């Protein structure tokens, strides 16, 4: 790639460190500096030409009386030919299609940021959240208010159904209700649905207190399930009886691979159960 070409000067736009690393052999730092500085000047001349064309094509200006502004049809025709017309179509502010839109800012943000790490590495953007690449830049995504924490769950569920290879998000919730080894699980989405609806429609359970003919049907143990969160699998977990004969397999049921020495460490209990130190 020699020597001093136009597209050569354009494509060289990149940090001086990259430029100096690739051209290490060929150039002598007097050439590297001059070439890079002439490259920036060419970059800037390019933005200026573009901005001059795009600015003079502004439909607000054409309507203006006595505002003599030279709109050079020469460069405009060529521009509207080589680019499918951009000087032709002007977008109203706040729209996604705008160059100044938060959409475009996100675009450059991603474009410059994903390369920050190696694809090998963990923190590679596209590795940690694939959500980003597939996402669309549509005015619906930019404009409509959406609830956070629901976005958080979209990711968590998607990552679990991909990893545990279950068919549906539903099946993920089932798997979530069976899971005994993690702290703050077994979670039972359906169960929490029941519990909360009950506690909402009949706050304080007064009718259950009022009509003991019904209350007499259910046992108090399961009734504890209303006021405090006790999943059926969790009831199963508290209820099961412990002998030293059971202790091993019951440890395998209630706990994952971690050995007793791991679990007994106080900081590990704290991390595991989401417990305050006190």
């Amino acid at each position: 790639s020699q020597c001093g070409f136009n597209c050569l000067t354009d494509i060289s736009h990149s940090s001086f460190n990259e430029f100096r690393q690739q051209v290490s052999e060929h150039l002598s730092w007097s050439e590297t500096h001059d070439l890079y500085h002439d490259a920036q000047q060419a970059q800037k001349d390019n933005r200026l030409y573009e901005a001059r064309i795009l600015k003079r094509a502004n439909p607000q200006l054409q309507n203006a009386v006595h505002l003599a502004i030279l709109a050079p049809n020469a460069e405009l025709i060529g521009y509207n030919n080589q680019f499918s017309g951009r000087a032709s179509q002007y977008v109203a502010p706040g729209t996604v299609s705008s160059m100044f839109s938060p959409a475009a800012y996100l675009t450059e943000l991603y474009r410059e940021a994903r390369n920050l790490h190696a694809s090998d590495s963990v923190y590679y953007l596209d590795t940690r959240r694939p959500d980003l690449k597939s996402m669309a830049l549509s005015q619906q995504n930019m404009d409509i208010e959406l609830s956070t924490l629901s976005l958080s769950n979209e990711l968590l569920l998607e990552s679990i159904k991909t990893e545990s290879k279950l068919e549906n998000y539903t099946k993920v919730m089932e798997m979530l209700s069976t899971f005994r080894p993690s702290g703050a699980t077994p979670y039972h989405d359906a169960y929490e649905n029941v519990r909360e609806v009950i506690q909402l429609q009949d706050p304080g359970l007064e009718q259950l207190n009022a009509s003991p003919a019904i209350a007499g049907l259910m046992h108090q143990a399961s009734l504890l399930g209303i006021n405090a969160s006790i999943s059926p699998e969790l009831f199963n977990i508290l209820t099961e009886e412990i002998t030293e004969g059971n202790a091993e397999e019951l440890y395998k049921k209630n706990f994952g691979n971690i050995e007793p020495a791991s679990l007994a460490m106080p900081e590990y209990l704290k991390r595991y159960y989401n417990l305050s130190d006190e």
Partner: protein
């Protein structure tokens, strides 16, 4: 910190998708640059984007600003302050910065600017110097004289590198500067040096 979205938020917190992606990539960039994440391409860090990150690229409003400035500068430019402007400009602005601005008051402040303009307009270039070895490169410095019973000397500088197309750029031209030192050389024996 890893997944770029908070998992302890309240149910009721509203952020559009595009925006949440933005704040996410923002936390990535900020953690990556200040080196809490293990390593990063020192090659990509040097890019003009991340150089302008701390001032212009963290904030959306600032990026919109910088980007717009090239296309629509009229929004940002004001007659009050132009950086950089002449000293005599400040003088004009102070003469004319009042609550009451009679037409007479303004024309007087204008004549005062014109008189302050006439001293610089008419300078006599006495002598010079060139910083570099040869003509072809460097910046030349000049010295000038003010028609006055006693000597007032102004020096302006020109860059030679800006003489691109066979004419001086006018970027190259530097504003004249007053000099405070008391100088009385005859006949024309004064010369400036770097």
């Amino acid at each position: 910190q890893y997944l770029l979205i908070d998992n302890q938020v309240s149910a009721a917190i509203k952020t559009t998708r595009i925006a949440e992606a933005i704040a996410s990539i923002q936390l990535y960039v900020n953690r990556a640059l200040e080196n809490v994440e293990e390593n990063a391409n020192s090659g990509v860090i040097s890019r003009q984007f991340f150089i302008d990150w701390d001032k212009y690229n963290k904030r959306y409003s600032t990026w919109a600003g910088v980007s717009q400035l090239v296309y629509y500068p009229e929004n940002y430019i004001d007659p009050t302050m132009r950086i950089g402007q002449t000293k005599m400009m400040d003088a004009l602005l102070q003469s004319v910065s009042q609550s009451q601005l009679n037409a007479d008051t303004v024309e007087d402040a204008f004549m005062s600017y014109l008189t302050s303009f006439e001293q610089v307009a008419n300078l006599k270039v006495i002598s010079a110097y060139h910083d570099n070895i040869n003509n072809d490169q460097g910046l030349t410095y000049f010295i000038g004289l003010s028609e006055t019973d006693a000597g007032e000397y102004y020096w302006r500088s020109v860059d030679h590198s800006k003489f691109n197309d066979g004419k001086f750029a006018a970027n190259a031209w530097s504003e004249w500067h007053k000099i405070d030192c008391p100088i009385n050389p005859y006949k024309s024996t004064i010369r400036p040096v770097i």
